[PDB]
Amino acid sequence: AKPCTVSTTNATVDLGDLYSFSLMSAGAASAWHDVALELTNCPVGTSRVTASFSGAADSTGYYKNQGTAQNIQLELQDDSGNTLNTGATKTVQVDDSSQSAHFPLQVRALTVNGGATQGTIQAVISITYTYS
Amino acid sequence: DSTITIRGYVR
Ligand SMILES: [Y+3]
Numbered sequence: 555a556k557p558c559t560v561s562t563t564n565a566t567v568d569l570g571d572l573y574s575f576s577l578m579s580a581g582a583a584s585a586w587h588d589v590a591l592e593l594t595n596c597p598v599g600t601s602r603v604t605a606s607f608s609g610a611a612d613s614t615g616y617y618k619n620q621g622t623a624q625n626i627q628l629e630l631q632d633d634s635g636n637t638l639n640t641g642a643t644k645t646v647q648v649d650d651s652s653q654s655a656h657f658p659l660q661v662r663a664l665t666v667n668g669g670a671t672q673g674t675i676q677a678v679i680s681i682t683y684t685y686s
Numbered sequence: 687d688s689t690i691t692i693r694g695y696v697r
Contacts, residue, residue: 562688564691566691572696589690623695626696676691677691683688
């Protein structure tokens with residue numbers, strides 16, 4: 555099927571400042587941050603959009619922090635609570651009333667082993683779309 | 687097609 559038009563070329567998630575005392579215990583994390591991927595001008599005949607997520611992951615399985623902060627990972631989930639680690643895919647239905655598709659996602663920082671250290675948090679997740 | 691950039695700091 556023909557591809558829709560990518561509306562969300564860039565999406566920035568600013569976690570802001572997180573303190574080490576709130577990231578000391580294993581499993582501790584930051585608050586959830588809304589992130590949406592939107593497609594438009596979907597051609598007639600194209601009813602499904604599949605997003606493929608890809609990014610550098612560390613030994614924990616989550617997205618590796620390319621920043622200086624140690625013992626910190628990044629997690630991407632859909633609005634249903636399902637984790638979308640690197641290699642994961644998600645399929646949504648196209649809205650034929652507006653010819654668009656949307657991917658309501660959530661992003662947060664977390665420390666799997668706890669003991670997060672001072673430093674920066676940086677990570678980039680690439681998304682590629684397939685249509686049917 | 688899309689890029690999600692995550693940024694922040696740990697104090
Ligand atoms: Y949400």
